[PDB]
Design a protein around this ligand. Structure first.
Ligand SMILES: [Cl-]
Length: 212
């Protein structure tokens, strides 16, 4: 695998968003991976709808929270519309996918990374952006501005984000808290400690879509 990865430099990452007060991190996580795989597979970089997942993933709980893997399964079975055709309203509503015309994109499956395994996650990121989870409730994570973050933070994960790259001592993470948080919306999380959870629980639960 390469020494350095950054899918932004391949034009596979859309601008940073802000989820607001809604508990929709799981949908923003999933869309990052969708935007990435469609660019890698088709050549187009486009913004897809987090609201559609919020409204239509019957296995999640709207603004109470949810699962990136179930969002990705829904996109594998049905598809997803463009974000501008189905914009973010910040509250759950009824599923309006049928009123939006044919889907803009569709994947063919979902895969899971074996947990607590830094190298398995690195291998997946080299192929495409990966949905991951972490503990974001600590003040240190909330006040982060740049550099390689070593914590403090525990492993009680609570927040889905996306890994869009890595380097020798870090993994590169795109958050959905606006550009005003972190390194222009991003954080470099330290890798290579002697902790099997990863720092901030980073290796707890990672998934990615597949698209023939
Ligand atoms: Cl280091």
């Amino acid at each position: 695998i390469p020494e350095y990865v950054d899918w932004r430099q391949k034009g596979a990452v859309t601008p940073v968003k802000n989820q607001g007060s809604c508990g929709s991190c799981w949908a923003f996580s999933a869309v990052v991976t969708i935007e990435g795989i469609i660019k890698i597979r088709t050549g187009n970089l486009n913004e897809y709808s987090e609201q559609e997942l919020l409204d239509c993933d019957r296995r999640s709980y709207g603004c109470n929270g949810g699962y990136p893997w179930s969002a990705l399964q829904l996109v594998a079975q049905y598809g997803i519309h463009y974000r501008n055709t189905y914009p973010y309203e910040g509250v759950q509503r009824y599923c309006r996918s049928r009123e939006k015309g044919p889907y803009a994109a569709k994947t063919d499956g979902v895969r899971q990374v074996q947990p607590y395994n830094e190298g398995a996650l690195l291998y997946s990121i080299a192929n495409q952006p990966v949905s991951v989870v972490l503990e974001a409730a600590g003040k240190d994570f909330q006040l982060y501005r740049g550099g390689i973050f070593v914590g403090p933070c525990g492993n009680k994960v609570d927040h889905a984000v996306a890994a869009v790259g890595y380097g020798p001592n870090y993994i590169l993470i795109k958050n959905s808290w606006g550009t005003g948080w972190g390194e222009n919306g991003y954080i470099r999380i330290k890798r290579g400690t002697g902790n099997s959870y990863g720092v901030c629980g980073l290796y707890t639960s990672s998934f990615y879509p597949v698209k023939n």
